[PDB]
Amino acid sequence: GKIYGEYLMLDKLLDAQCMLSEEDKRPVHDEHLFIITHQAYELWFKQIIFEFDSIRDMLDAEVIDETKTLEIVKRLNRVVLILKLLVDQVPILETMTPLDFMDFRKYLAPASGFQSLQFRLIENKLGVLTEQRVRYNQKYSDVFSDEEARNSIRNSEKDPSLLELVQRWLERTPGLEESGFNFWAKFQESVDRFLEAQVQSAMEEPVEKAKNYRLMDIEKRREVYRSIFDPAVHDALVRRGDRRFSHRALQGAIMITFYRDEPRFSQPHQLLTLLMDIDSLITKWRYNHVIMVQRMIGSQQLGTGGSSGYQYLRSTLSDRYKVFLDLFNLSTFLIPREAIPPLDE
Amino acid sequence: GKIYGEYLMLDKLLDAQCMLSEEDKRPVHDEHLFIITHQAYELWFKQIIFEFDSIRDMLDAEVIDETKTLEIVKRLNRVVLILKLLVDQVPILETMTPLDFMDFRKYLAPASGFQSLQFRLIENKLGVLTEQRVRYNQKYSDVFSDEEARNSIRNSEKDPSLLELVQRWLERTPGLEESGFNFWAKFQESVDRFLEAQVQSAMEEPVEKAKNYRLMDIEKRREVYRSIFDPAVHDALVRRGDRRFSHRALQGAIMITFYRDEPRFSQPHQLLTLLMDIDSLITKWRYNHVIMVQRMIGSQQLGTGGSSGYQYLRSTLSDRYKVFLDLFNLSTFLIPREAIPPLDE
Amino acid sequence: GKIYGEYLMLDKLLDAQCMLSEEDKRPVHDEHLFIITHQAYELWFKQIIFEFDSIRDMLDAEVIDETKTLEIVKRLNRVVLILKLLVDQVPILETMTPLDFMDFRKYLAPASGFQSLQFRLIENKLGVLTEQRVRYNQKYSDVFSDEEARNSIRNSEKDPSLLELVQRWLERTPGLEESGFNFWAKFQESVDRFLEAQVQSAMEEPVEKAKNYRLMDIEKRREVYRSIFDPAVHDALVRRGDRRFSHRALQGAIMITFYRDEPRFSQPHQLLTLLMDIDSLITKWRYNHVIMVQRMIGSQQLGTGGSSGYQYLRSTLSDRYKVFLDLFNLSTFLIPREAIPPLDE
Amino acid sequence: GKIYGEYLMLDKLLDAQCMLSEEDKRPVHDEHLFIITHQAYELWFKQIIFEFDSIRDMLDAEVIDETKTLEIVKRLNRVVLILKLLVDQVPILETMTPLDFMDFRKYLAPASGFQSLQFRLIENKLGVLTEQRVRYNQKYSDVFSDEEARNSIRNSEKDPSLLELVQRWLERTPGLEESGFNFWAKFQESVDRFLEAQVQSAMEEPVEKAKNYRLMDIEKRREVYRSIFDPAVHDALVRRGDRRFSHRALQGAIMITFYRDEPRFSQPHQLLTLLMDIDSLITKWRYNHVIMVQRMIGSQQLGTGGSSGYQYLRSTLSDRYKVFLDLFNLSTFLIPREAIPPLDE
Ligand code: HEM
Ligand code: HEM
Numbered sequence A, B, C, D: 001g002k003i004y005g006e007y008l009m010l011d012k013l014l015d016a017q018c019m020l021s022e023e024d025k026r027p028v029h030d031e032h033l034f035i036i037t038h039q040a041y042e043l044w045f046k047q048i049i050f051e052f053d054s055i056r057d058m059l060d061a062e063v064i065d066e067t068k069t070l071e072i073v074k075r076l077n078r079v080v081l082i083l084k085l086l087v088d089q090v091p092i093l094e095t096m097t098p099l100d101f102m103d104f105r106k107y108l109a110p111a112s113g114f115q116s117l118q119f120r121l122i123e124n125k126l127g128v129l130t131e132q133r134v135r136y137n138q139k140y141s142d143v144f145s146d147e148e149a150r151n152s153i154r155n156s157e158k159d160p161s162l163l164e165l166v167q168r169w170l171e172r173t174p175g176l177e178e179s180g181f182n183f184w185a186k187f188q189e190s191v192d193r194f195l196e197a198q199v200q201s202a203m204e205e206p207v208e209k210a211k212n213y214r215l216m217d218i219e220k221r222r223e224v225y226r227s228i229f230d231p232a233v234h235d236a237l238v239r240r241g242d243r244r245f246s247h248r249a250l251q252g253a254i255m256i257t258f259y260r261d262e263p264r265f266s267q268p269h270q271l272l273t274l275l276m277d278i279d280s281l282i283t284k285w286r287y288n289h290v291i292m293v294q295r296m297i298g299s300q301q302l303g304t305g306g307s308s309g310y311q312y313l314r315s316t317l318s319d320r321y322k323v324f325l326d327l328f329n330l331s332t333f334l335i336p337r338e339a340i341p342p343l344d345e
């Protein structure tokens, strides 16, 4: 259409609100808020999926130019803003009293009446690994009984996640080229030179206690650099789940963080930063959600079957559920400006 | 139902998104965001109306006890939070480029494709007076052509607004009773005594310039108190639109602000405070909205017919559109703690 | 004075900014931001302490009337707002690049150059128990070497915390009186009656699987109520650190949450709610802080001595550091409106 | 130093808080908050000035490369975040009751005790023109009596503002070169061609009413383009204060908004966007400030000398006080993607 309500299909949208306590002649005022809050979330979930899918398609290519990079940054930044908004929607629902919630929670399935298809789709499309999930809601068949739902989740798991496609993009970054700039080799070399210089400076320290601390610290630094310079050590950290990136992907990430001030790397950096922001904001939502759940129905209530639901949500707060874990730690491997191999080529 | 998607009618809700540039084989990515943003707004608009109507019904009674007062405070506070959220939704849409918006704005009616029924309902239910509106969108028939829409707006105008019902509630407040506490009389008396004391203190001022400033100020204070103590002056200020409250309503408001620290008046105060917050937040939304409009289509663009739409929105920012204008100014009439007639009875 | 800058002592305040990289002829622009950010925090920390101390003094009395209650609510609400602001200050500092921070971090003591006296004072004044802290920064002497600092922290530990004084206030709440309303006894009775009614309804269930789930659930409910109705079980939960309140304090808390809709209990409830908000916001700050630290210097960097600092901060995120832990769980013990003993007396 | 409190000069910073109602044996609790709130503002004001000055110095050069551009974007973005924070500090102070403020406002000079040197410095450094200010506080000598203050304000007025330096930068943008890309000429040409095409399409319209609206609209579009293509019309709009940019600066701005999707223009665009954000946020602060003032002391109170202070603040809300007014309107001159001259050279 052309008129507001026809274009936005408001006749459909605003007829999707059925208060179950109302049609059962025992009306609870706040049930209206409950419905609207979730529906607002669900609309935004759909937008997030829509942005995610379009970024997946753009990343599923051999060449990502500067122009498409900007478009991705924009869309990731948009998701960040939506996520902040979703974090702030929780205190609106927290405004309903526990006793009011109790008077209509009976109209809801114990665990099925609280699980969102779209949220699970967001997790998978972002890159939450199935094996990283806790035992409780690990298999999606146990969570969702519907058939069309199962097909979507299966598709989300099999299809390339945002985690996978970012890794492939990270592997192709210019500068890791042995033939060209050869950053990894130059990096190792400057780590050796910088650390050597550090040992000599520490040996010249007048106070004995200060010498020992610096020597101990330099040794702890060697162990850090061993975990990135020895591919065997890295692959081990991947297998136990302390890292997620392939070795070459981490190489790309580290290079980006190094030259982030440089016009050629500023946008790739921004992309990574927004990836972290998204991860962190999802965690922030999780935290707010669990505080609200506990505020409403404690750790356990009638019909809840004990405290396993609460304990599950509390365990989703762990780094096991963070998709871009490697990104948070990248400054661990950082050396000062002077020691970084200059960009010339 | 009992399962998430059945309860929230997600099959209806998530089938209300029709991108018109998509079905016309010229797809603009950001059109999806455009639709979702408005739909999120519309869902919240429905919640605001739902909260407003329930407050209207509660206020449409001769006796409002302490218990129902708390429930009203809660619901007004809920509306405040929703409004803050709606203010923060604007920068999400501002993330779409003007050039992208240009590629699908043709699918929208020039002024009809931007006017929301529910928003207009919120304005009227809150208490925006029709005569206070600017010439442009004053008559609702010119704005909305639909029949069911016209009936709702007509009903919103005729039915008691939040402004009306608050006034009636304000008129009944205990303490304005000549037989009882007789606040208005005690107030006048203490104004006289306080002002008298101020004149004498000013006459004793050593510096001549300081004496004159204080004497001029006391005269400006008399004029202030004349505008509330002389009903003729008040009624005149109502007629020209500088005030909205009846004389007795303003008397109630002023008393509440005076004893706001007192347990018996703290909730009535909170109610008034949230009324102001709501007004101010609607203004804050208006401001953000106009900045976004100008960011997208400037003051005027192709098909827009010049700059009358923009100038209209810019004029909605005036105090003519604020419903609880009297509330913002109440501290003008304030006298210090010592001069306020103590609560005894 | 009377003029802005004299009153606010701006000559002192704005002469407290000494960039150490500047006077050492190697200036880092962002060091100015680093200083200002902390100084803004420190000013707010002082305000929080000032509000806390005044609430401590008000609670350190046998009778807290309705009027003083409102004043406490106001001041706790003020602290909430300040805390939200402090949470939002982190992304401002996150705007400094790691490489820029590296160029001036040498001017700072490894662990001493990051520890705030006032923050530690806030923790203790709120009620963080010393034994609940992790091994790393448990004893304040190891943290702070200064003499005046040690005296303040010692005073904060020995003096009655906000946790202690709230408990005493909770113990005195009217309604726990055996002679009067006798809530605890009435509560036990209605738990028995409600649970009995639940067993009979479960026995009448047609489906066998549904009968068993409900019977298992009712058994899990008995265990919940045993932990509050048997003082021995409660005291055990206190000793291991799962609870903090005395038995009578928890009794008070539970009663408040039950009749929160009632004018006489709404403010006491609000007080408890703000206590939770404060706790949660401190946790939210902790989370943001740790994300920023990792963004700047990873899990470990040169001079840092390995990853013990990072791991410490990450462990401050546990419920061991939450002061009002009991408050978060109160809805666990909730029974529906009908089953709650009515207020008559 | 190396320890937290020595580095941050906390002994100086935390000794700058003198409550005047306290030393005069009539203590008002909230006076502490009043002081801290302003001091927090003042610290941030100093940071804003510090960021502004460093951007001024960077822009005061003939060549601004891609690298320095990024640094400017970063610092403008930092100012945006600080400004949002400052907007959110107002509701913290709004938490003090009017009656409490009344009990210590006597210790403050009527207009001098509310004027901030640093704020005035921010306004001038950003680019608020002296002639654009209202009569009330137009001359700084009338506002500030101190000598060192007068010298700083004089220096801020004479020295190149952020407005001036951005204009010069805008004038030099590559693409306005007649010898090179020649954007202005290509732009005029494509406006003619696009408008011609619009007339023909309008003439072919079946409905007569629709033909007339489109013809009227095209005429309104010609008037828009006349105001930018005829330098005489532009210069007139500058003189009356509807525009601020020189003709060539506006040419630069318009080109940037056109090719904002292009890697070469994305950062220059971002710079302009943040300039608008800063302007708008200052306006948002102004609005919040005036609402708070009215909440505390109404439109006028004892000692205030009538309502001129309030009316002044309310007039600072006009576009006369917006520095980058031209930037808000740039989409007015926009033509669709197809009609824009492609970047080749
Ligand atoms: C009265 C308010 C609410 C309560 C008591 C509540 C309770 C719960 C509980 C107990 C679970 C665990 C499900 C299970 O047993 O397996 C859960 C999961 C979830 N909830 Fe809520 N919830 C509330 C509001 C919301 C809102 C407003 C949203 C926004 C869409 C939401 C989104 C979710 C999502 C996405 C999950 C799955 C989480 C995961 O698997 O990590 N909830 N909720
Ligand atoms: C590309 C983004 C947008 C543009 C260009 C835009 C433009 C406009 C224009 C030009 C008007 C005046 C209508 C007239 O000519 O009479 C208007 C009114 C309105 N708009 Fe928007 N708008 C946008 C987004 C939104 C969003 C996201 C909402 C949220 C529901 C919204 C809500 C309204 C409302 C409620 C009115 C009526 C205002 C009143 O009468 O005071 N707009 N808009």
Ligand code: HEM
Residues within 6 Å of the ligand: C037, C038, C041, C042, C093, C101, C110, C111, C114, C115, C116, C119, C137, C289, C292, C293, C296, C297, C309, C310, C312, C313, C316
């Ligand atoms: C470049 C930015 C920052 C870094 C790298 C940083 C790093 C750290 C580290 C490593 C610790 C642990 C101290 C230890 O080793 O024992 C710490 C503690 C702390 N930091 Fe920061 N910090 C930063 C900014 C801030 C800011 C802006 C504040 C606000 C006042 C702040 C407040 C604290 C407080 C209060 C503690 C003690 C925490 C506790 O004991 O639980 N920090 N910081």
Ligand code: HEM
Residues within 6 Å of the ligand: D037, D038, D041, D042, D093, D101, D110, D111, D114, D115, D116, D119, D137, D289, D292, D293, D296, D297, D309, D310, D312, D313, D316
């Ligand atoms: C009880 C709270 C406050 C009241 C009643 C108040 C009142 C005023 C008044 C009446 C003016 C006009 C001055 C004149 O007469 O010429 C003013 C100006 C100003 N105030 Fe406040 N103020 C308050 C809090 C603040 C705070 C927290 C800040 C933050 C630094 C602030 C910053 C300013 C600034 C920067 C101006 C100059 C504005 C301009 O010239 O456009 N004020 N204030």
